[PDB]
């Protein structure tokens, strides 16, 4: 299950590339065992040992020794060292920078009524990001017997989920972000204001930090789940705590 | 998590310790890379003992 042959929907299988490289190594291996069972001529077992050296080689790292054995489509197979290496290996792609739950993005806009410890954040994104909190709050106040009942309650968007969102939102920082995150002030945690619409209103004194025009620049709102991370977003990362550039 | 192995019929040189720019099998044997590959491609013999 780290080199899967998962069937994508449609009866088509979607194998990895390591299945190809192992399949080739094991074929040439089994064939060499046979060529030694038949007591073969020397040149044939030498050829088979060379082919096996190539196959184990193209498995451990392909494109290193001589030319790359090409995949089925027309392309070099991504052998193991290509799993790890590069901008897209495990090290930089899946291990240093992970995708993240509790997060979203939409267009940013102005909203100058704001105090600069808050960011206008839409009702719909906020009710989407804060569903664990809402479910716990609803079954805590007893408005929903089971967790599934709370689920359908917030999906129907009744008049109590918006009250519960306004209450599990209240003193809870979120972490706005802009795409090229050059310096450490391009992640600052705000306190959400629930706002109609679908644009994350961002305070106007904050654009110098984030470096934001308001002509389409999207922003990502992550969430501090735990209690220590709410405290670090409030004390350390808040928007009223870095009003001096660390440079 | 369970891994598996393959019993190679013949031995087989791990490429990283043979082709990494300073060749580890190379400088361990104090032997140039070209001669090691001439042995590995089944071109030329090599003496031992």
């Amino acid at each position: 299950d780290l080199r899967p042959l998962v069937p994508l929907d449609g009866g088509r299988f979607a194998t990895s590339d390591l299945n190809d490289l192992y399949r080739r190594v094991i074929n040439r291996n089994n064939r060499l065992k046979r060529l030694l069972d038949l007591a073969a001529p020397d040149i044939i077992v030498r050829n088979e040992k060379r082919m096996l050296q190539e196959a184990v080689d193209a498995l451990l790292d392909n494109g290193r020794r001589g030319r790359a054995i090409t995949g089925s489509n027309k392309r070099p197979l991504k052998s193991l060292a290509d799993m790890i290496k590069g901008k897209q290996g495990r090290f930089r792609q899946n291990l240093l920078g992970k995708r993240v739950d509790y997060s979203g993005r939409s267009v940013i806009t102005v909203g100058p009524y704001l105090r600069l410890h808050q960011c206008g954040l839409p009702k719909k994104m906020a009710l989407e990001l804060f569903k664990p909190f809402i479910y716990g709050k609803l079954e805590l106040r007893g408005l929903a017997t089971t967790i599934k009942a709370a689920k359908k309650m917030v999906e129907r968007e009744e008049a109590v989920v918006w009250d519960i969102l306004d209450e599990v939102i209240r003193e809870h920082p979120v972490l706005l972000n802009r795409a090229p995150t050059l310096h450490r002030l391009g992640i600052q945690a705000f306190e959400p204001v629930l706002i109609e619409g679908k644009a994350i209103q961002l305070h106007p004194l904050v654009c110098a930090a984030y470096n934001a025009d308001f002509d389409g620049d999207q922003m990502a709102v992550h969430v501090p789940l735990t209690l220590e991370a709410q405290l670090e977003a409030r004390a350390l990362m808040m928007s009223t705590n870095n009003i001096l550039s660390p440079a | 998590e369970r891994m598996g192995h393959i019993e190679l019929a013949s031995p087989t040189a791990h490429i990283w310790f043979l082709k990494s720019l300073p060749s580890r099998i190379g400088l361990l044997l104090d032997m140039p890379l070209r001669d090691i590959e001439r042995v590995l491609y089944f071109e030329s013999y090599v003496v031992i003992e």
Binding site: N47, R50, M51, E54, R65, G66, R67 | R34, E37, R38, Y41, F42, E43, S44
Partner: peptide
């Protein structure tokens, strides 16, 4: 003429 090639087919 031994070396100068990393192709198995030629070999």
């Amino acid at each position: 003429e031994i070396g100068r090639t990393t192709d198995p087919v030629r070999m």
